[PDB]
């Protein structure tokens, strides 16, 4: 199937407490496989997946160096943006960077990504053409022209069209044992009365991977939104994910409601009824 490699960088300045906290995580689909933490004693990029652990020392030495480079780049930019936004040097601030590349079932390039944020808001984003940028404020126009003048898009597109998808093919190949799995959801339903005239139905789906899934509650076949409750998709902690969707029904009317579970690892959609 299609796959994506995604890196998530977060650098948070901590005035009066030392250099900013730098956190890097590497993903293939929803499977984390590398990490770096500025506060951890190792000062190395550390493996978090079994198929990445075989990578030679040259890999870990290079990945640690380059992610350290991204750590110094973030520290410089925090002050540069502090000047752009004219904010006190005493306050803590946040820069979030996400980038990555997608490939299709043939391993051929589909899309490239690069998004940078400041204090939880969009700052600059690499456009789909991988040749131009989108600015969110006057401060980003400063960076936009700088990167237009410095030709930053030339470096990002080269990696995203090259080393990004090239190594995504290698990770998916060396990790074919785990990354090509489609774990179907294990579903069930629970029933709790709230009063003499109402009750709660909660449709479950556990142990599924990847996390993309659809839970739909219908009454007489029509999708219901009122009196529904849908929580975040959550990881079980073993490489699988969990989700549930609820609906409040009048007592004696449970039979009219159906939960519809759609997932990639299921050959055909499941329909759960209160039996």
């Amino acid at each position: 199937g299609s796959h994506s490699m995604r890196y998530f960088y977060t650098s948070v300045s901590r005035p009066g407490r030392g250099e900013p906290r730098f956190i890097a995580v590497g993903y293939v689909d929803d499977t984390q496989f590398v990490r770096f933490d500025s506060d951890a004693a190792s000062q190395r990029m550390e493996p978090r997946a079994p198929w990445i652990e075989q990578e030679g020392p040259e890999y870990w030495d290079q990945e640690t160096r380059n992610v350290k480079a991204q750590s110094q780049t973030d520290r410089v930019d925090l002050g540069t943006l502090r000047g752009y936004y004219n904010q006190s040097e005493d306050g803590s601030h946040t820069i979030q960077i996400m980038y990555g590349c997608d490939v299709g079932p043939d391993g051929r390039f589909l899309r490239g990504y690069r998004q940078d944020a400041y204090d939880g808001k969009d700052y600059i984003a690499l456009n789909e053409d991988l040749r131009s940028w989108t600015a969110a404020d006057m401060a980003a126009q400063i960076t936009k022209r700088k990167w237009e003048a410095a030709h930053a898009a030339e470096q990002q597109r080269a990696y995203l069209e090259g080393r990004c998808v090239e190594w995504l093919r290698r990770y998916l190949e060396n990790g074919k044992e785990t990354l090509q799995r489609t774990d179907p959801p294990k579903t069930h339903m629970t029933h709790h009365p709230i009063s003499d005239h109402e009750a709660t139905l909660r449709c479950w789906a556990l142990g599924f991977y990847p996390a993309e899934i659809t839970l739909t509650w219908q009454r007489d076949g029509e999708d219901q939104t009122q009196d529904t409750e849908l929580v975040e998709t959550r990881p079980a902690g073993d490489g699988t994910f969990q989700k549930w969707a609820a609906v409040v029904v009048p007592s004696g009317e449970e039979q009219r409601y159906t939960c519809h579970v759609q997932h990639e690892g299921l050959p055909k959609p499941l329909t759960l009824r209160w039996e």
Partner: peptide, 10 residues
Amino acid sequence: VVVGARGVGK
């Protein structure tokens, strides 16, 4: 792997 070595300052 990570970015093509060099990074451009903001």
